[PDB]
Amino acid sequence: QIRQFQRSLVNQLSSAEDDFNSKETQLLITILSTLSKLLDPGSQQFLQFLTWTVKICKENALEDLSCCKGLLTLLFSLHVLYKSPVSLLRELAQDIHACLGDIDQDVEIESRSHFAIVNVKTAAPTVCLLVLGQADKVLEEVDWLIKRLTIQTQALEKGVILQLGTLLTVFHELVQTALPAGSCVDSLLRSLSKTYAILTSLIKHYIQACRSTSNTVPGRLEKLVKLSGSHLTPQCYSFITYVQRDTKPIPNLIFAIEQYEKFLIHLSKKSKVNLMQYMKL
Amino acid sequence: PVPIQHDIITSLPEILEDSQQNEVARELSCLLKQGRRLTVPILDALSRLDLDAELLAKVRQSAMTIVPSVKLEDLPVVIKFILHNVKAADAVEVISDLRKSLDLSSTSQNCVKLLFDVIKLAVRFQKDVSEAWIKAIENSTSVSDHKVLDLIVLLLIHSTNSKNRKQTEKVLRSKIRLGCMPEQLMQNAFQNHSMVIKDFFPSILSLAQTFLHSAHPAVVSFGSCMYKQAFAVFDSYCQQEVVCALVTHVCSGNETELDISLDVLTDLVILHPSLLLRYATFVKTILDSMQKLNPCQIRKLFYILSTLAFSQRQEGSYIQDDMHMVIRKWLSSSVPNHKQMGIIGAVTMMGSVALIECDGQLSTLLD
Amino acid sequence: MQIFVKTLTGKTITLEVEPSDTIENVKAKIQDKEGIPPDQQRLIFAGKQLEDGRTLSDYNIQKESTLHLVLRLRGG
Amino acid sequence: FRVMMAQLESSVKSIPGEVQLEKLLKWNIAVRNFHILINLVKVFDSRPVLSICLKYGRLFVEAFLKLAMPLLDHSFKKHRDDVQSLLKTLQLSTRQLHHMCGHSKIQDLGLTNHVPLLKKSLEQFVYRVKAMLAFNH
Amino acid sequence: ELATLFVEVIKRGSLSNGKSLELFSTVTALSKESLAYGKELNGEEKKQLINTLCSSKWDPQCVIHLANMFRDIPSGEELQFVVEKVLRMFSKLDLQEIPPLVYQLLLLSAKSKKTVLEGIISFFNQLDKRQKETVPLDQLRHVEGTVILHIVSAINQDIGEELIKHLKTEQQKDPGKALCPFSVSLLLSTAVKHRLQEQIFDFLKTSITRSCKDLQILQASKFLQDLCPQQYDVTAVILEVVKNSAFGWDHVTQGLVDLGFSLMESYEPMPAQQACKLGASILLETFKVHEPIRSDILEQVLNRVLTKAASPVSHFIDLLSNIVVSAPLVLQNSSSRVTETFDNLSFLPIDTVQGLLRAVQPLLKVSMSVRDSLILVLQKAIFSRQLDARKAAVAGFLLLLRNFKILTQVQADVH
């Protein structure tokens, strides 16, 4: 059935799928997904599929084949090696026009892979859908990479530092670059808002863990916290300007600096480490 | 006569043509004012069906003042109609109307039995009567000017729900804390209409074991009035539940629980002379495992034990024997605090003699 | 048979079983033997307590097995 | 310092047509002046009593900053010549807590006493203000 | 006084002669208050003899030495060091003969409390460990029902607070604390007699946590974490609870029933619904296993038959289905009560009539003493109703007609 659906629907994504290819496209994606749901529980099938999918994702994209083809990209590539989120999130930084530098620029749209940028790159369809998609896979990597917070250990410390630095570099592209095509006055605002507060909360639990047992974790935490300051610590500031009734003055995402304080408060314990000095402020 | 009227109303009341049937039903429900005959017969096919859809609702609009000062049996019947006929969402407000009109709660237990038949076939038929009795108390009755049927219905609705009990406990202690209808009428219910509250005896007991390890002042002091008022005039089979609550529940209970148990058994062995017989052994069994008492807590134990054991003639035997035996048991040789417990017990027993061969027993205690 | 009734005494004390014995036939045979009275005993029959009306067949009982034969004074 | 500034927070939170706007203006202006002197003198005390100011003032910069802004948005043009006045006594003290005061990060493991919640109250007053003018004009 | 010889004679040479607990009675107090090796100490923390004697018989030397030490206060690493040393011959070898476990250690906890936790591990170590790998298993059963009698004679402390300290922390408290196969045995047992609803709530949190950690842990940490979230203990404690019934000791095997009214009693219908299902499957296992009380537990589904005024769909339905199919049925041992569920239950739910009928018919219908006792009721009870009570007439008419095999023959309506 992967033969049937892939052959036909990719035939459409190659040649068909004009103005006359929407429902054919949508049913293409939803089929491919809900058959993938047991499509390759083992590695031969599952990896053949995810390879066939990224192979597709080198090609162009459209306003409904953004959201669903992305969702299927998420299910496959995020159960396939579940830290693929950071991997996928690395691909999510391209020329998508948003506050890249000197204020306006395109520091990151969706194109760190630059051919994934084919799919989530081309224009405001790429910007809007991949702003939403980075936001969602962000919350995913968060609630699960903030799930190794209880599980103490040494495996959990290795895993947290790895996945955390991945999610942080993700947010580094997704803030030094342009979130809502820069602005996107609902969903780009919101990605910045929630993903910022979540990033601060998760960073709080790891700093909090040091408070419980703190004998020698200063090396790995030093990598982690210096990275956190230079990447996701300064740029939330320049965000606070390059993103800031009549139009509903509901910028409730603004008092997610009290999460910037939660990171500082725990950092302020500083027991045997001048972390504000090994980091930035 | 209405025997023939209500007779043929019974049979047509479910099985009738339904096209002129519902119209003729509304015809009699237009005739249903002048008598209280057609109230019950309508209310059967106005329990089965609706002769009109708001024909039902208008007829139930008849139902509110339809029984303001009704008789005994017309109470259960017109209540079955006045609540469960068509209980809509806004029929919850319907409940409130009845709670204002005919709920002055008064053979008499048969009157309670009919009140219960209506109220409790509806208490677990349609759930809205749960919200109905909730709004009957919590809105404006479970605070200001409480009916004794408020406490009774709380026994039925506010305590006797399957899963509509958690907030049933919230409003159950809600005005139960602010003195919204406090336990000074709890004596009136738990005295005058007993098995009308007693069939919910597990509910009285849920009020005891949860609102009696309580920490508000007069809620606790009214909940201890329950286990007081319950284990006195109730039935003598759950009285093992009273005197195994005021005994073992004051065994491993607390500083608060031990105070409640001492005061429970104290209110028993003071306020009840006779009833301290049947459960004597249970408190005797709580008279052993004594790892919590000061000379007023352990002395409270021995104050109760001797409060009964030196009180009856033919019945003091196994108690008093076990008493002298326990005193000589611990306070004969030794235990880490044991001699303190013993000397306290011995003195307390002498207070038992402090009221006679008990001077010989005091010889035995010095012995 | 002789159930190895190793109660709070400290050995593995013995008996002579009654497949229709007393509900405390072991209790009488030990309350004479050990000394503590046959109403102030309590024997852990495999994990449950002995049912002092029915005899030790009701336990699914054995021979040589170990009752947990302890006892405390309620009067004391 | 603590006993006073706590009293001042309590009294400010106590006070809540165009006569109403004139009243609220007067009472808030009195209050804003009281707090003005309080912060200034808080440039006179030391480390045990900066904390009292941090705490009472986080309570205050969010005391009217959601608890009196009900009025200062409604008389935002018709009263309108005190809106700059109350706003300016704000902006003075608000410079005190942020642009000077929260220097525990310069307290020091005793300045969680206001550091997260205080930075929250400051961003909150700023935002509720730029929506307390744009929602008037 | 007289127990100095435990250094060089009693625990050294020519010792293990019994009655010298009286010889301990010169001053059974050498090992809450303890530690006289020359100097009221920690239970196993202490001088020359009373510290270093604990290689063999430090606090108690015999089982009578054990209970005599308890009579003398002198418990910590002594009972535990022996419990590693003697387990199933020398500590609790029987319940009674060898059972200084079942008698001695439950002597020692008599007369601090967190030491009992190690005793559970001292119970758990090979005991129920070797079950994973006069009766070896029966020695299991005697030690288990004894240790449960021991916990119970304790409760009759609030170790459950430390139990909650054993409940959840850092993966030490977090996943392993209910993971005792008789750990849950003791939890349910101790909670049995009274003041246990916090322990129920603890196990409800344990099932919510097993649901949670597994649901997430399908994907959230596979290469990162290892398997068994919360130990993976949902079916773990389920197979363990069949084991408590399997030994046949009724310590809490018939206490394990009220862990099902705290399964379906707050049932909805992942996490918040698979727990009603855990409770239901537990009720089914303990209806098929604990065969004596089955008419007392399947007479307990009648509670969710009474309160099913729109309440009991999945619980009553799948419950009465499984137990009624498994049991021959009360066989009129249910029939004394269970007749008028039709307009009693359907008068709440139209899923009531169909479900209750399609359950109680393969027992009460083919019984035929209450088959004409039930489908008599509906053809009366579906005379005149609302659309909710016309539906019950339709339903039971269909249920009788479909379930009485027809055709001549011994037919449904021919014989």
Side-chain angles (χ1 to χ4, degrees), chain A residues 16 41-42 61 70 85 93 98 101 116 123-125 133 135 155 159 165 178 180-182 197 209 218-219 229 234 249 251 256, chain B residues 1 3 13 25 35 41 45 53 57 63 68 76 88-89 91 122 132 136 179 182 189 202 208 215 217-218 223 230 232 245 253 273 280 295 309 316 329 336 342 345-346 351 354 360, chain C residues 10 19 28 35 37-38 46-47 53 75-76, chain D residues 6 16-17 30 48 57 63 68 70 102 110 116 131 134, chain E residues 3 13 18 29 36 38 43 60 67 74 76 99-100 110 119 136 145 154 160 175-176 178 181 191 220 229 236 246 248 255 260 269 271-272 275 279-280 292 309-310 312 327-328 349 355 359 362 380-381 389 392-393 395-396 412:
Chain B
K329 187 255 182 189
Chain E
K380 303 181 297 173

